[PDB]
A paper describes a structure:
Here, we report the discovery and characterization of Cucumis melo agglutinin (CMA1), a new R-type lectin from melon. CMA1 comprises 291 amino acids and is predicted to fold into two linked β-trefoil domains belonging to carbohydrate-binding module family 13 (CBM13) and placing it into the group of R-type lectins. In contrast to other R-type lectins such as ricin, it lacks a catalytic domain.
High-resolution diffraction of the crystals allowed us to solve the CMA1-Nter structure in complex with LacNAc at 1.3 Å and GalNAc at 1.55 Å (see data and refinement statistics in Table 1). However, only the alpha site was found occupied with a carbohydrate here. CH−π stacking and hydrophobic interactions occur between the aromatic ring of Trp36 and the alpha face of the ring as well as the hydroxymethyl moiety of the galactose residue, additionally ensuring specificity for galactoside over glucoside as an equatorial conformation of the O4 hydroxy group would lead to steric clashes and loss of strong hydrogen bonding. Further, beyond the C2 position of galactose, a cavity filled with coordinated water molecules hinted at the binding mode for C2-substituted galactose. Inhibiting binding of CMA1 to the GalNAc chip through a dilution series of N-acetyllactosamine (LacNAc) via multicycle kinetics allowed us to derive an IC50 of 1.4 µM.
Numbering used by the authors: 6 to 132
């Protein structure tokens, strides 16, 4: 079943669409957690992760590719399919790369990177 949640990463900050804008290609970052819609993510059985009607996708499939939101219908399965493991690893299924934070200061855009089991690579769910 789909579950709506916050995605909580390094230092208890939340995955956040910068500025709250739902336009295609707006990047994601870490931001102090709050009730705003751009921090509410729906994990679906189809493998997508959605906010504001859009899908989390990397802009590419290589280490260091940033993540952003995009139209779920302007995305192929490779772009939009993720798997959140119980230990916190959030894997981009096609590439096997993992969602990785790049700082807790403002506008630190998240990327997909080779898994190093870093503290920047562990994502928890919370109501
Ligand atoms: C036009 C304008 O100034 N809009 C802003 C919003 O963009 C802003 O939304 C927040 O932006 C931060 C990043 O700076 C986070 O993404 C946060 O989750 C958003 O809520 C709001 C609040 O600062 O202020 C204006 O509305």
């Amino acid at each position: 079943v789909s579950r709506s949640t916050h995605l909580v990463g390094q230092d208890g900050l939340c995955l956040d669409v910068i500025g709250g804008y739902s336009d295609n290609h707006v990047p994601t970052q870490l931001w102090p957690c709050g009730p705003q819609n751009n921090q509410l993510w729906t994990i679906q059985a189809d493998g997508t992760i959605r906010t504001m009607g859009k899908c989390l996708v990397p802009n590419g499939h290589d280490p260091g590719s940033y993540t952003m939101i995009d139209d779920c219908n302007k995305a192929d399965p490779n772009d939009k399919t993720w798997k959140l493991y119980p230990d916190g690893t959030l894997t981009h299924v096609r590439s096997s790369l993992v969602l990785t934070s790049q700082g807790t200061g403002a506008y630190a855009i998240t990327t997909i990177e080779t898994n190093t089991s870093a503290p920047t690579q562990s994502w928890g769910t919370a109501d």
